[PDB]
Ligand binder design. Structure first.
Ligand SMILES: COC(=O)NC1=C2/C(=C\CSSSC)[C@](O)(C#C/C=C\C#C[C@@H]2O[C@@H]2O[C@H](C)[C@@H](NO)[C@H](O)[C@H]2O)CC1=O
Ligand SMILES: Cc1cn([C@H]2C[C@H](O)[C@@H](COP(=O)(O)OP(=O)(O)O)O2)c(=O)[nH]c1=O
Length: 397
């Protein structure tokens, strides 16, 4: 049974955090795990039991708002995406050509490097999805392309040509379009099937294990106040979070109000830049959302899948304030399932947020649906089921 498992991934919070417990459970079962990452993420990855395979990352330093704002076609993001994939591919082949893994597990983002390594080494592969899974019916990629307003990457000759030669030099007998729309034989999705868009269309190639998490001390620590105010998490995530005005207006509206607000900035905005905060309002660069959500009454989030799932794991009603294309599908789905109030873009000013937080906290119908979804999240199976699926896949392969 014992195997050398490689996890191909890139330098991003949302993509890495869900995988940590899974790494640990596998190491516990006596498997060896190599994990591709960069920079500061190396530390938590090792602590989870994995051997780190460093690659030079471009996204880890990038500002997504700026990248997608650079040109009006998205040429810059498209080509950065390829480079990040290529950087990952080269580093991993270098490190592991001599220590070839039995299984290649790759996140959605580096799926090109994922397929290429699996083919180069003649190994089975597993795709990991930290957001919505994609199949022949629903494509999360297309959804994001359309919502982002960029050109279709395959309508970009230079992108298409690069990818083409990349497959060519690697002898992969697969066309660009088929490579791009490749559905792997096994998929681990960190979402409950009930939340997945078009969930019922997903067959046995997909295992919906939902979220799985530790205390995540590496994100700092947190304890609720010694008072009786209901706690409210407020976060714009880690990606499109350069929004001082938003956090300031939030603190202002909640000033003197019957809530305790915990705001997380995600490494972008400086807490000081907010000015003086009401006594019932905290501001941090980082605190574990799981620890706040355990004590929380309401979760205000832009719609990052991690935060949504950590929130629904505790059955907290939602106020989703999407400020960008990458979370529009998550927010749309929460709205569809009636799991919270959605305040898109400009709508999410402080006063509107104050009312929404109050509304969802006291909506009995909404609360029922949130408690039911919590159920689905709990049944998902998390890390243990992921590992079970992996080991069963190994047995077949
Ligand atoms: C998972 O599937 C993909 O990543 N798709 C793609 C994305 C692209 C470049 C990314 S890196 S540039 S640094 C900014 C792409 O250039 C183009 C495009 C249009 C929309 C998109 C998305 C994809 O990026 C996504 O960005 C989001 C902001 C991140 N969420 O917060 C996702 O983690 C990440 O995946 C082409 C592409 O294939
Ligand atoms: C900003 C922030 C994120 N997180 C976690 C929650 C998620 O699991 C993960 C990803 O952030 P998330 O809120 O999902 O935003 P994004 O769209 O940028 O991924 O990071 C914290 O634990 N504390 C924080 O302060």
């Amino acid at each position: 049974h014992m195997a050398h498992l490689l996890i191909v991934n890139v330098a991003s919070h949302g993509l890495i955090l869900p995988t940590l417990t899974v790494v640990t459970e596998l190491v516990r079962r006596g498997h060896r795990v190599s994990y591709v990452t960069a920079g500061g993420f190396a530390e938590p990855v090792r602590a989870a039991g994995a051997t780190v395979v460093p690659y030079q990352s471009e996204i880890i330093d990038a500002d997504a708002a700026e990248v997608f704002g650079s040109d009006d076609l998205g040429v810059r993001p498209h080509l950065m995406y390829l480079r990040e994939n290529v950087s990952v591919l080269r580093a991993t082949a270098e490190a592991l050509d001599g220590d070839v893994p039995d299984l290649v597990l790759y996140d959605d983002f580096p799926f090109i490097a994922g397929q290429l390594l699996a083919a180069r080494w003649r190994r089975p592969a597993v795709r990991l999805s930290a957001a919505f899974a994609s199949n022949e019916h629903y494509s999360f990629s297309q959804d994001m392309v359309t919502l982002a307003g960029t050109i279709d990457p395959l309508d970009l000759p230079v992108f298409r040509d690069t990818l083409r030669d990349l497959l060519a030099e690697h002898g992969l007998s697969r066309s660009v379009v088929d490579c791009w729309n490749h559905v792997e034989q096994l998929n681990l999705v960190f979402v409950p099937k009930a939340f997945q868009i078009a969930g019922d269309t997903f067959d046995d190639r997909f295992v919906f294990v939902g979220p799985c998490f530790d205390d995540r001390r590496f994100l700092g620590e947190w304890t609720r106040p010694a008072d009786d105010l209901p706690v409210v998490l407020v976060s714009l995530g880690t990606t499109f979070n350069d929004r001082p005005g938003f956090f300031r207006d939030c603190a202002r509206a909640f000033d003197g109000q019957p809530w305790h607000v915990v705001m997380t900035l995600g490494g972008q905005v400086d807490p000081a830049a907010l000015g003086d905060l009401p006594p019932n309002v905290e501001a941090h660069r980082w605190v574990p959302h799981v620890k706040v959500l355990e004590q929380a009454t309401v979760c205000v989030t832009h719609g990052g899948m991690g935060t949504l799932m950590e929130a629904l794991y505790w059955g907290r009603p939602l106020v989703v304030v999407p400020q960008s294309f990458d979370v529009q599908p998550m927010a749309r789905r929460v709205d569809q399932l009636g799991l919270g109030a959605v305040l898109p873009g400009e709508k999410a000013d402080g006063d509107t947020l104050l009312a929404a937080v109050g509304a969802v906290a006291a909506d009995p119908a909404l609360l029922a649906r949130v408690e039911a979804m919590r159920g689905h999240v709990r049944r998902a199976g998390g890390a243990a089921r992921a590992a079970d699926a992996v080991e069963a896949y190994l047995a077949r392969a």
